[PDB]
Amino acid sequence: SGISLDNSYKMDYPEMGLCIIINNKNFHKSTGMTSRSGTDVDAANLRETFRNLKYEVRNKNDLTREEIVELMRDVSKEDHSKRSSFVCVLLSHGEEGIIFGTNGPVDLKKITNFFRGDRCRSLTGKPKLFIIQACRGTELDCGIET
Amino acid sequence: SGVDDDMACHKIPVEADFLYAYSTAPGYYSWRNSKDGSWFIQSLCAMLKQYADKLEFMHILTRVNRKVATEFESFSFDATFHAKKQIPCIVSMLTKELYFYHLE
């Protein structure tokens, strides 16, 4: 054939892929973490947005730290051969490098490591997108007038 | 030649092909409105709805950065938390351009 370029990911597999949305709104009383009012609007907006991009959206609400890890492990062990990409959206409280389950923290590296190129073969070479609504510390940006 | 290029057996990094679309810069709070949702997710959805059939993903996320940065500012009865701003943070380990659409 004619000249070929390889500058964009192949996005015409049979399926665009999964979009896993973890929507943590209510936290166990013993943690003292306040409920995240407004997060259901985000989870609904994301579901609609990714549905129109033809992702298979799976919404999960109020998962413990153990459930988050188990969900990620199980998803990483599916056969993604016929999927172009993978998306995970995390909506929770957080700190730098950490997202909260309803009963305590999960290191973001633990979640993303399941999808490493050597650990999720059917996603090797395919874009893996993690969208994270959570704090990354306690600094405040005062802004500057333009 | 050289010792560290032109390998006979091709590998890629195990950390390649990841993209982390963080709602805020490292070290910072991330803001959420109790009625409308988080500033970042509101803006990300709006830009994907408008531009996913038109722009490469990094360029969509750059519009999300501009929308969050310019259109939102916190309102709080607590002066400590009032009038604050936010910039999201795109962290790309991707190796190719990403378009949500393809040629038919």
Binding site: R36, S37, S92, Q133 | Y29, W31, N33, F75, S76, F81
Partner: peptide
């Protein structure tokens, strides 16, 4: 109302 995460 505004809160943070």
């Amino acid at each position: 109302x505004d809160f943070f995460x």
